[PDB]
Design a protein around this ligand. Structure first.
Ligand SMILES: C[C@H]1COCCN1c1cc(NC(=O)Cn2cc(-c3cc(Cl)c(O)c(C(N)=O)c3)c3c(F)ccnc32)c(Cl)cn1
Ligand SMILES: C[C@H]1COCCN1c1cc(NC(=O)Cn2cc(-c3cc(Cl)c(O)c(C(N)=O)c3)c3c(F)ccnc32)c(Cl)cn1
Ligand SMILES: [Cl-]
Ligand SMILES: [Cl-]
Lengths: 122, 122
């Protein structure tokens, strides 16, 4: 047989987000300026070319802290971290530029492309 | 805004499966008889009432090995582990009973319900 459960992936992602919200099995702290965000390395690697390229390297795979560029907008980062765990991207005229620049940095090409389609009608 | 990416969850899950296939950041070995299966605790907790109840307990959250009931059919387990990481459930007349009994054990209620709808037309 070949049975597909169409809500399984989204249900897994929701439960991964629930674990993040309770700090269960999170294994990295992402530092952006004074802001610190706990996450699961596997989700970060699954959603970001930057985090994938960092954690794939055995020299950096076991790092518990990752200091990002301090010029990154923490609100921008948080929006993309939420997107990572929810499939929902919360863009506003007062964050599109920060979110598009931060998505570029994190190598989330499909979010940068959507930020472009977004500005093309803003 | 409220932008939803409809393929994000399934893409994350595929990338989590890719990491599993390369043994990247797997943090548990599940032992079923002589068969050993490496996985990510977070995915197991997100897909199984059994693994969720075990890893939620701080007494067992940091366990690197989990010995399951040796009477569990390893093929049955592997089918459900693949389902966990793929959303696809591969049932055949020669595995439905083993997969339905193993799903019961792992507390994957929606897989047991589908195994019931399945047998109702088998
Ligand atoms: C190497 C790859 C293929 O050959 C088999 C092995 N495979 C592979 C790759 C892995 N990680 C990555 O690709 C990292 N990454 C993730 C995304 C990504 C994912 C989702 Cl879901 C999104 O929505 C968006 C978005 N909206 O922007 C962006 C991404 C990207 F846009 C550009 C570059 N990199 C990205 C992992 Cl963890 C396991 N296997
Ligand atoms: C406590 C819960 C609600 O209140 C907020 C907190 N929340 C919560 C719960 C978590 N884990 C679990 O629920 C464990 N579990 C997972 C599944 C499950 C998941 C998917 Cl996707 C499936 O396809 C199937 C299936 N086809 O069978 C089964 C499951 C089940 F059917 C029965 C019991 N337990 C299950 C996690 Cl990790 C994080 N938060
Ligand atoms: Cl902080
Ligand atoms: Cl083995």
């Amino acid at each position: 047989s070949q049975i597909q459960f169409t809500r399984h992936a989204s249900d897994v992602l929701l439960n991964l987000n629930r674990l993040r919200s309770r700090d269960i099995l999170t294994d990295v702290v992402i530092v952006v300026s004074r802001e610190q965000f706990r996450a699961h390395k596997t989700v970060l690697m699954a959603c970001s070319g930057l985090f994938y390229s960092i954690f794939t390297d055995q020299l950096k795979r076991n790092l518990s802290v990752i200091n990002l560029d301090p010029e990154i907008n923490p609100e921008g980062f948080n929006i993309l971290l939420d997107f990572m765990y929810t499939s929902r991207l919360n863009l506003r005229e007062g964050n599109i530029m920060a979110v598009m620049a931060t998505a570029m940095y994190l190598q989330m090409e499909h979010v940068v492309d959507t930020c472009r389609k977004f500005i093309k009608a803003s």
